[PDB]
Amino acid sequence: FDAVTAFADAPAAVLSTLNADGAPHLVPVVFAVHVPHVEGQPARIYTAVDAKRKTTRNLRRLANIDRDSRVSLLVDHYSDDWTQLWWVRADGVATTHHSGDEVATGYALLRAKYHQYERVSLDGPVISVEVSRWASWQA
């Protein structure tokens, strides 16, 4: 069982950020993982946001990250057979990018993973999560 691979291959993760008063917030995301092949460098998790400025929403995860960059993401596998349960969690620091190489990198990885991005537009900011630790569990 490779935790990083199991996480990377999954379609959806839950992203947790901190609200202004410190309480946790949760939203699901689609995402792509970059495993740096210079081995010994931290993994990167990329996720795009469908948010326009001044006249729209989905603003909360961005506003949370801007105030406090500490985040966690979890991929879970449920089964009716509880001996088949597992999960993988990434804890890390999120940076929001509105231009540059990170946006390019994020867009690239996201399109490669999700074919839905052939029809669904991809013109919002990209969150880059530097993973400080991976955790996992199997039943």
Place this chain on the structure above:
Amino acid sequence: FDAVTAFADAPAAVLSTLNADGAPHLVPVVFAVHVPHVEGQPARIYTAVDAKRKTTRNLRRLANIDRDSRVSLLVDHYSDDWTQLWWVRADGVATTHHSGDEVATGYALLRAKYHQYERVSLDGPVISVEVSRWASWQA
């Protein structure tokens, strides 16, 4: 939409608690919801922690809740058809019970929901979450 029923029927949710340094901690749980048949009263979400065996992960989670009762739980539904995505979130205040009526109430609801508890033991503390707000989204 009906968000509460959708949440209540789902097999698994992601529970977010706060670590000692205030950063989010995430773990998936099985859970059961009590919706009061009286108007005004908040819903309660119940989830059990095993005490057949003590584990570092479970002591961490219990300590987080003891330290700060603020939690969030999310049920999400992924589909490769992104027009069918949805999620439901409960924000609330968690109390851990090691005996008493909350444990009885939680055990009863959990056994009613999960047939797996016919084989899996249920003799640990029960986390009872008083829901302060529900949120939901549909694609």
